[PDB]
Structures are given as C-alpha cells and as structure tokens.
Structure 1
Amino acid sequence: AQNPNCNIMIFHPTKEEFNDFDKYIAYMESQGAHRAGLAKIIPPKEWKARETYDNISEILIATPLQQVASGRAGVFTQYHKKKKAMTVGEYRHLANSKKYQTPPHQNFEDLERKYWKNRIYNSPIYGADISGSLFDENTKQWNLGHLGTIQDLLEKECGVVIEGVNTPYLYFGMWKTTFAWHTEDMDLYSINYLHLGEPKTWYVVPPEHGQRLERLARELFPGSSRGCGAFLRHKVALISPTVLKENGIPFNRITQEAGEFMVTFPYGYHAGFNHGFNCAEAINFATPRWIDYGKMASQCSCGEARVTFSMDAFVRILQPERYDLWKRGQD
C-alpha cells in the first residue's frame, strides 16, 4: 500500500506531464497521494496562469463576509456577517490597513502560533465564493475554467445525463481569514490555485480517519450536533492543531504559496487560514473513484447548509432514498 502513514505529498510534473489533467490525478493516486486527503502540485517552470495580475482591481466583491468568532481560542465557531460591496482594489487597501494587516513575525511557524492564539479576538473580512476565473483563455494546461465537468463524469461512468453546470470561484483573503473544517459537497475533489499574494496554511485529516474528526466535533460542539447529524456541512467549526493532538486525531499541515496548486481528495476534511492579502481560485471535480464516495456522502437536511443548483441531480441519482428529505432542507 502506497503512502501508508497518509503524509501530504508534493509533486513536480514536467511540462509534458502537465498536459493531461485526468492522467496526472490518477498518477498521484497510484503513488498514494489521496491517503493524506490533500496534495500539493508545483507547476513546471515553463507554465503560467496568466501574463500579469496588474489589472484585477476592478473586480467586484458584491458581498464581503466579516468572520465573527465565538468560543475559545482552540475551539470556536464563526458566522459570516454581510458587508457592503467593494472592489478588489478597495479590499486590498483594507487588508493592508493597520487594523487588518499581517503582524510582524519570524517565519510561518511563528505566524501559525499567533493565528491560533489570537484569531478569535479579531473579525477579518473574506471575499469568498465569487463566480469567475483569472486563468487566461490561452492557458491550456490546468486551467480551472476548462476542466471536464462533474455532470459529464457522472454521465460517462453511470450513463445518466443530468442538468447542471460546474464553474470556478474566486477567493480574496486577508490575514486571519479562515476556512472551517469541511469536506466538499457530495465528498467531491477540489483543486485550488493560489494566484497571488500571501500564503494559505492548510490542515487535513486522512479520509480513512474522517469519522474520528466527526466524533470529536460532536463532543466539542454538542448543541450543533443535536441540531444536525451532518453539521460540519455548515462550514462554521474550527478546532486547533493543539486540540486535535490532545484528542489523538490524525492530521497533517502544509503551507501553500503563490503559484502552487492544492488538490483535496474525496472525504478529506480540511481547514485553514490566510497569511495576508491573497487571491485563490478553486473548483470541484470528479473522477471515477469519486462515485463511491458520492453515494455514501452525508448530507445536511436541517436547512443550514443550502447549496448550488447542481447538487440536486447528484443527490437525486446517487442517493435516491435521501433525496426527498434533503430537498425539504433546500426548500
């Protein structure tokens, strides 16, 4: 069995290996990369996502989200308070302001310590989930707007044609902006490219141990757990590495820098934070190996998780028993 300790693997494809996206994912899995839940891919030196980032300031963040925390430093939830629209240039200036800018620090580890000590005492503003792409149309390799669609994969594997579309999303971050512990919708893969700016630190639980993290979360968030049998689908709960170590939960950590891709694998729980002003692009995708995970994915039916149009068909075809209850949650 490859990668039996479930370590995060880092890959350096050549320009020739970067041509065929599906084939490279399957290669990484042949080496055990999925066992970690997360892998890093450093593009060949010849590759670029676009020519420059000099002309992005007029992108609109229609609904910036202020991430307000409650709890204790290592165990907290966050809610998202909607703020007035602002452009990317306005948001960058805000991120760089004395109130929001990254503090002086020695290295990534010192910054990680400061994040976990102090996060809860501040409310950073995140431009998340903005439909669009920063890949140049002429970039043919690993262009997250040109991937094979999940609807086409389901049709190729299972024969059933379904409605829905699959497009990428932009994230504009600042110091302390936070992504809560989650797996993807329908336990899909994700791919995330950090286009510019400061790093993103990730934490991940191996898929084979995801139920250990769920059982800890039910203990640490007991009201939320009574409200919903899949409350981590709400994407609001944070648990620190120190607390994970105290409770014996297997995990790994890694820092992504600008110009690097991260892939999350089916049922790989992940969480993390941004070091400073940055912009990332991400999308979900599927492979043949996903289908079995999609069929077994938990679902939120309490009303909180509310998701895209395209998840309807996935539930309807892969989980027909759950469909009626899940759809009530959506309505």
Structure 2
Amino acid sequence: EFVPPPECPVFEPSWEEFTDPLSFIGRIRPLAEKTGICKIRPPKDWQPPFACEVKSFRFTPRVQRLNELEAMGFEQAVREYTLQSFGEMADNFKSDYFNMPVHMVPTELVEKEFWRLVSSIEEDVIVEYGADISSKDFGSGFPVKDGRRKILPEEEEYALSGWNLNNMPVLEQSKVPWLYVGMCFSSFCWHIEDHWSYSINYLHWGEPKTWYGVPSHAAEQLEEVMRELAPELFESQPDLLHQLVTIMNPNVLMEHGVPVYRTNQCAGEFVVTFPRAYHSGFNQGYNFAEAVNFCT
C-alpha cells in the first residue's frame, strides 16, 4: 500500500513575523526551497471572515475519472450546484464510500484509497471538482474594499492584510485569485506555475487538502521520470498540455530517487509553493480553497 512521503515544513510565525508575507517567505526560503512546498499557520487570533456571495454562488464542476490514464465521451453528465447542494453531494459521497461519518475517516485512509483508485482497473470511481472558478464571479473568499459587499469594522483588518490573497504582488518586472470547491478524491495533477511563479494557497474552510511537493532542484529528475513512465501518446506533448494529465503516484517518483514531501493543509492554513516546485494533491472532503501566483 501507499507509503506517505515525509512531511514538509510547517511554520507558526509570531505576530511580529506575520507582519510582512514577502519578508517572511524570504526568511524561510533556505529551508522551504529545499522541500518545494511549505505550510504556514497564522497566529491563533487571525481569523478572516468568509466573504463570497453565498446566496448566488452556483457552478458546474468538472468530472474527474480517477483511473482515466490506467484505463487507456458521455460517462457522466454534471449537475449544476450551489455551495450548499455541492456540500450535501460531497458529504453523502464520502460517508457512503467509507460507511462512516465524514469527519471520522482517517486522512491516511483517504490517501491510501485515492492512490489505489488512481491505478485500479477493476473499480471506476468518478468525482466532481469545482475547480478554477474566478474570484471575479462571486467575489473572493477574503473581504475586499471594492464596495461590492459590506465590510464590518472587525473585518477591515483582513481586507487590508498582506496575507489576503487579493493584496499579494502579481506584476513581474519586464491576475486575480482562483477558487477551488473540493470533495473527497477531487484532485490536481503534477505541475509547475506559469513563468515558474511562486504560488500561495489558502484553505478557507472544510476538510483538509492533501499536498505533495518536489523541490525545484529535482525538477529535471521529475520530468525525466514522467517521460519514462507517462503514456507515450502524451509524452511527446508540450509541457503546458502534458500537465493536464501528469498524474503519478508519489511512491513511483520516490522509487526513482525524486524527493517528495507531503502535507495536510487544514482550514485556515496557507501553503506556499516555491519557483519551479512541482506539486500535486487531492481533497479529503468538502472544502473551499483560494489560490494566486505572486511575484517577489
């Protein structure tokens, strides 16, 4: 069965360290760039309100067939959901799948089952992911001073915070956050960012998001293993298309000498990915994440 990779670094900045995100990320870089990804827990009292327009939030998530590569056009037929109705679907799926309440399923069991399903020919599990929803559609999950929604006085600090993903620097010398509504086993395959950018990711609420990261010094190693083992039909494809289908069990990479680190990101925690750090992951259950690429 699946062997979990070693844990990536988790930082718990003091209020002083938490004052300036870019300065903090610059200070942790000597360790975090050797692991590709890191997790950042804000101070206990830092709790932004959730600011999306929940009444109107509606979307059609994309269908994900976990074993689609191993299996090598009308299978499912995706409903439109609200946040509430997607959550009911997601929780019913997971509690039915594991025969237990959703909060009682061990994170290690979901992880082992996910990778078993990805390689399974005998069982075809299909899930849905509300992925790549623009923050322009119904707003960011962070409060923003654009006069579209009311900001209470207690929330203004969060609208002005440098850790609000809307306030991260995005202009490179010579771009808004995206939202992800997850359910159990919804996933993202191995990729790096455009322009080898940093990215920052915040889990607003819900069950954890499980991550795998590879430090940039091993980017070429990972790409070589991919070419050796990815389907040939897709191996010859340019990277920006191959990255749509680069699903690979972390233990395969590890057997080929590629360093891989993991983490479970819980509600209210950040994950930072460093330049050219390949990353992949899946969701443990119903959750809501926001992500943006940023410039230093």
Q: Give the TM bin, normalised by the shorter chain.
A: 0.7 to 0.9
Q: Does 1:143 align with 2:164?
A: yes
Shift of 1:252: 1.2
Residues 1-331 of structure 1 mapped to structure 2, 5 A cutoff: 8-29=8-29, 31-50=30-49, 56=54, 58-61=56-59, 63-68=60-65, 69-72=67-70, 83-98=78-93, 103=98, 104=100, 107-119=106-118, 121-132=124-135, 133-137=140-144, 138=156, 139=158, 140-141=160-161, 142-149=163-170, 151=171, 153-154=172-173, 160=174, 166-221=175-230, 222-226=232-236, 228-230=237-239, 234-287=243-296
- Extract unaligned runs of 5+ from structure 2: 1-5, 145-155
Quick one: structure 1 residues 27 and 49, their matched pair in 2 at CA, closer, same or farther if it must change by over 3 Å?
Answer: same
Q: Is the 8 A contact 2:51 2:143 kept in 1?
A: no
Superposition TM-score, scaled by structure 2 size: 0.80
Q: Is the 8 A contact 1:197 1:277 kept in 2?
A: yes
**Secondary structure, aligned partner of 1:67:** strand
CA RMSD of aligned residues (A): 2.6
- Extract unaligned runs of 5+ from structure 1: 1-5, 155-159, 161-165, 288-331
Q: Is the 8 A contact 1:100 1:174 kept in 2?
A: no
Q: Is the 8 A contact 1:43 1:260 kept in 2?
A: yes
Q: Is the 8 A contact 1:198 1:276 kept in 2?
A: yes
Percent of aligned positions that are identical? 37
Q: Is the 8 A contact 2:127 2:185 kept in 1?
A: yes
Superposition TM-score, scaled by structure 1 size: 0.72
Q: d(CA) in 1 for partners of 2:214 and 2:241?
A: 14
Quick one: structure 1 residues 91 and 102, their matched pair in 2 at CA, closer, same or farther if it must change by over 3 Å?
Answer: same
Equivalent in the alignment of 1:314 = none
Aligned residue pairs, count: 261
Q: Is the 8 A contact 2:235 2:242 kept in 1?
A: no
Tell me: higher relative CO, structure 1 or 2? Use CA pairs within 8 A at least 6 residues apart.
Answer: 2
